[PDB]
Design an enzyme around this catalytic site. Structure first.
Site, PDB file in Angstrom:
ATOM      1  N   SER A 139       0.846  -1.221   0.000  1.00 46.91           N
ATOM      2  CA  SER A 139       0.000   0.000   0.000  1.00 46.91           C
ATOM      3  C   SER A 139       0.899   1.298   0.000  1.00 46.91           C
ATOM      4  CB  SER A 139      -1.010  -0.025   1.169  1.00 46.91           C
ATOM      5  OG  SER A 139      -2.124   0.761   0.871  1.00 46.91           O
ATOM      6  N   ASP A 153     -15.857 -14.260 -15.722  1.00 52.10           N
ATOM      7  CA  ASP A 153     -15.212 -15.292 -14.895  1.00 52.10           C
ATOM      8  C   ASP A 153     -14.573 -16.383 -15.770  1.00 52.10           C
ATOM      9  OD1 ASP A 153     -14.472 -17.352 -13.032  1.00 52.10           O
ATOM     10  OD2 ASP A 153     -16.550 -17.595 -12.342  1.00 52.10           O
ATOM     11  N   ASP A 198     -10.841 -16.866 -18.490  1.00 52.99           N
ATOM     12  CA  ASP A 198      -9.606 -17.608 -18.129  1.00 52.99           C
ATOM     13  C   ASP A 198      -9.716 -19.150 -18.248  1.00 52.99           C
ATOM     14  OD1 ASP A 198     -10.762 -18.552 -15.475  1.00 52.99           O
ATOM     15  OD2 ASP A 198     -10.467 -16.379 -14.869  1.00 52.99           O
ATOM     16  N   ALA A 254     -11.772 -21.134 -16.340  1.00 52.92           N
ATOM     17  CA  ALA A 254     -12.309 -21.726 -15.131  1.00 52.92           C
ATOM     18  C   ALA A 254     -13.443 -20.879 -14.565  1.00 52.92           C
ATOM     19  CB  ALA A 254     -11.233 -21.863 -14.098  1.00 52.92           C
ATOM     20  N   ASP A 288     -14.828 -20.190 -11.575  1.00 52.54           N
ATOM     21  CA  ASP A 288     -14.459 -20.339 -10.177  1.00 52.54           C
ATOM     22  C   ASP A 288     -14.771 -19.091  -9.387  1.00 52.54           C
ATOM     23  OD1 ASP A 288     -12.555 -18.759 -11.431  1.00 52.54           O
ATOM     24  OD2 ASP A 288     -10.826 -19.801 -10.569  1.00 52.54           O
ATOM     25  N   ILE A 334     -13.616 -16.156  -9.980  1.00 50.71           N
ATOM     26  CA  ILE A 334     -12.402 -15.315  -9.993  1.00 50.71           C
ATOM     27  C   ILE A 334     -12.050 -14.857 -11.412  1.00 50.71           C
ATOM     28  CG2 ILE A 334      -9.893 -15.249  -9.510  1.00 50.71           C
ATOM     29  CD1 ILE A 334     -10.792 -17.465  -7.227  1.00 50.71           C
ATOM     30  N   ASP A 349      -8.302  -5.702  -6.260  1.00 53.67           N
ATOM     31  CA  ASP A 349      -7.954  -4.659  -5.305  1.00 53.67           C
ATOM     32  C   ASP A 349      -9.018  -3.541  -5.315  1.00 53.67           C
ATOM     33  OD1 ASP A 349      -6.718  -2.472  -3.924  1.00 53.67           O
ATOM     34  OD2 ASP A 349      -4.759  -3.419  -4.271  1.00 53.67           O
ATOM     35  N   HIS A 374      -6.909  -5.880  -1.526  1.00 53.54           N
ATOM     36  CA  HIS A 374      -5.827  -4.948  -1.253  1.00 53.54           C
ATOM     37  C   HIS A 374      -4.878  -5.471  -0.189  1.00 53.54           C
ATOM     38  CE1 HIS A 374      -3.522  -1.385  -1.472  1.00 53.54           C
ATOM     39  NE2 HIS A 374      -3.770  -1.012  -0.226  1.00 53.54           N
TER      40      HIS A 374
HETATM   41 CA   LIG Z   1     -12.156 -17.654 -13.599  1.00 52.71          CA
END
Ligand SMILES: [Ca+2]
Ligand SMILES: *[C@@H]1O[C@H](CO)[C@@H](O[C@@H]2O[C@H](CO)[C@@H](O)[C@H](O)[C@H]2NC(C)=O)[C@H](O)[C@H]1NC(C)=O
Ligand SMILES: *[C@@H]1O[C@H](CO)[C@@H](O)[C@H](O)[C@H]1NC(C)=O
Ligand SMILES: *[C@@H]1O[C@H](CO)[C@@H](O)[C@H](O)[C@H]1NC(C)=O
Ligand SMILES: *[C@@H]1O[C@H](CO)[C@@H](O)[C@H](O)[C@H]1NC(C)=O
Ligand SMILES: *[C@@H]1O[C@H](CO)[C@@H](O)[C@H](O)[C@H]1NC(C)=O
Ligand SMILES: *[C@@H]1O[C@H](CO)[C@@H](O)[C@H](O)[C@H]1NC(C)=O
Ligand SMILES: COc1cc(/C=C/C(=O)O)ccc1O
Length: 504
Positions: free
Chosen positions: A166, A235, A238, A240, A242, A244, A378, A418
């Site tokens: 940070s 999502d 990529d 997957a 998941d 993320i 973040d 973050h």
């Molecule tokens: Ca993903």
């Protein structure tokens, strides 16, 4: 005895403009009480898990400024010196980092940045106090800390390290840029460099959302709706599904898709104005003259960002920056922030707080290594700003990634918020709260030690996703990629197998 060396140590300290407040022996297992810690820091204790000798000092940095400085010299010492850094606009010593790194055998310092507490008010009318925050606090603790280390241990220190995130990330880069000889290895997370523009960008969120209850504002529920639609759209890019976004640079979401239809429940969709708000939030901040100040917020950080950035109030750190430093008017109205203010702030750039020098050849020449990382969800400092710095360094130094790899490596960490937390494998060992054991393969700090001392550069940086926080069972790990690479799920095997991913 180690205790006896410690209780005799105050008499051996005689440093100009340094007042020793006390020297105490602190055995492992002690739960330190910190009654004097500034109330706004919100920490009055720290468990110290291994024996240290604790030195606390007040060090005058000018006739109108001083730092509080702690040095924790461990019994089980590895010959390595280390400095920690700060968070926000705060002088909070990060006692959690002092415990962490002293517990790993580092002779460790941390200073309060030159003032007490999380407010920017101590900068007001006090340029020397601001200069301590910008560069002089960290450097002073390095100079004094190295002195104390050599006084206390016959062997001195063989190498010097930095650990911060940070504001602390910024201070690591200020070291690289201004004090190339302070550290052999620098570990700098989610850096608050491009700092003046970071404040402007933080302030501009209010101008987009407006206040709670206005036409242009979204509630936390709507930000959750928006998050789920962002995942629907991004999502799976990529490979997957998941929850993320492994590299949100490929995510350009289109939120007009969730504008309310006739007969739709108003709590599950956006008005047109709200969609416009969201489109602007994922757009960069440009200044007077049409020049780029700060890149977009990366999609995926919405749940925690709704509380901190999009909460319908002017962000506090930037309001403080504009009131106490830019305009010296505590009543300056942060609801009326405009890009004209951002121009004034950027031109002022006090003591080069921007920390945005892209020519870091002096660091390279001195033999230093820097490892930086940034979480890709973040909510406070956009990961895209670290990507911008990387481009600028390559362009300015006139070299490609293969050359930068010799002294400057940047890892982009999927599912990290973050500095710590997030939905995915954030457990990279930058702090106790992200710890997955001490071995270099699982721990970014010890990976830097290995790069510096054995010449082994990290290719990827492994993180853990915990079942229920550090210390709980590891659910899965992932080897985060070295920029400009990104992670892609290829199989075989499920996405929880780190071997099923490739950096591409
Ligand atoms: Ca993903
Ligand atoms: C800022 O906070 C620190 C505590 O973190 C203060 O340092 C203490 O001050 C008292 C009074 O002089 C000493 O007797 C203690 O030993 C100090 N503690 C430590 C950890 O050094 C410091 O005074 C504060 N700075 C101000 C008010 O300028
Ligand atoms: C240390 O002390 C504080 C109270 O001062 C407490 O909140 C904290 O949980 C303690 N830690 C341990 C692990 O005993
Ligand atoms: C205080 O320090 C400033 C800044 O370094 C210096 O110019 C000035 O002469 C000093 N004043 C006093 C009272 O010592
Ligand atoms: C939004 O979703 C998060 C999980 O990502 C949940 O924990 C939180 O309670 C939700 N917030 C609101 C305001 O519903
Ligand atoms: C709309 O959603 C809320 C939950 O957010 C629910 O309580 C309410 O009954 C719904 N209204 C209609 C008209 O369906
Ligand atoms: C992969 O693991 C996740 C995590 O539990 C789970 O959601 C999913 O069902 C798994 N896939 C298969 C094919 O087993
Ligand atoms: C602060 O000055 C500079 C800014 C940039 C920015 C490039 C960009 O912002 O796209 C490049 C070189 C500079 O010397």
């Amino acid at each position: 005895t180690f205790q006896g060396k410690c209780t005799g140590f105050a008499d051996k300290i005689n440093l100009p403009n340094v007042r020793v407040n006390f020297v105490n022996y602190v055995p492992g297992g002690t739960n330190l009480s910190l009654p004097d810690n500034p109330t706004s820091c919100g920490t009055t204790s720290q468990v110290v898990s291994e024996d240290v000798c604790r030195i606390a000092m007040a060090v005058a940095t000018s006739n109108s400024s001083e730092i509080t400085l702690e040095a924790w010299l461990p019994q089980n010492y590895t010959g390595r010196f280390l400095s920690t850094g700060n968070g926000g606009l705060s002088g909070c010593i990060q006692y959690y980092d002092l415990a962490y790194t002293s517990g790993l055998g580092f002779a460790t310092v941390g200073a309060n940045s030159g003032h007490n507490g999380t407010s920017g008010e101590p900068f007001y009318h006090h340029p020397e106090v601001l200069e301590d925050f910008v560069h002089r606090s960290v450097h002073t603790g390095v100079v004094v800390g190295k002195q104390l280390t050599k006084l206390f241990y016959e062997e001195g220190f063989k190498k010097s390290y930095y650990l911060g995130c940070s504001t602390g990330g910024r201070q690591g880069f200020k070291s690289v840029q201004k004090y190339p000889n302070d550290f052999d290895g620098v570990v700098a997370g989610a850096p608050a460099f491009n700092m003046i523009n970071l404040m402007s960008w933080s302030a501009h969120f209010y101008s987009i959302t407006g206040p709670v209850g206005s036409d242009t504002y979204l509630s936390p529920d709507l930000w959750n709706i928006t998050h789920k639609e962002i995942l629907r759209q991004c999502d799976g890019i990529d490979g997957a599904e998941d929850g993320i976004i492994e590299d949100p640079s490929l995510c350009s979401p289109v939120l007009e898709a969730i504008i309310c239809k006739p007969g739709q429940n108003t709590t599950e969709c956006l008005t047109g104005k709200q969609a416009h708000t969201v489109r602007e939030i994922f757009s960069p901040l440009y200044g007077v003259n049409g020049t780029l100040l700060y890149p977009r917020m990366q999609p995926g950080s919405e749940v925690m960002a709704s509380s901190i950035m999009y909460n319908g109030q002017p962000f506090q750190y930037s309001a403080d920056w504009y009131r106490y430093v830019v305009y010296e008017n505590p009543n300056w109205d942060a609801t009326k922030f405009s890009v004209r203010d951002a121009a004034v702030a950027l031109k002022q750039n006090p003591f080069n707080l921007q920390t945005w020098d892209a020519d870091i050849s002096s660091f390279r020449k001195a033999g230093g290594k820097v490892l930086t990382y940034h979480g890709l969800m973040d909510q406070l400092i956009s990961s895209e700003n670290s990507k911008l710095y990387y481009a600028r360094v390559a362009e300015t130094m006139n070299v490609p990634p293969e050359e930068l790899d010799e002294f400057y490596r940047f890892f982009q960490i999927s599912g990290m918020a973050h500095c710590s937390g997030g939905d995915g494998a954030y457990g990279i060992g930058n702090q106790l709260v992200t710890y997955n054991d001490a071995n270099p393969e699982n721990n970014v700090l010890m990976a830097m030690v290995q790069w510096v001392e054995k010449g082994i550069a990290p290719e990827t940086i492994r993180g853990a996703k915990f079942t229920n926080g550090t210390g709980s069972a590891v659910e899965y790990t992932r080897k985060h990629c070295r920029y400009p690479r990104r992670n892609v799920y290829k199989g075989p095997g499920n996405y929880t197998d780190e071997n099923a991913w490739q950096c591409v």
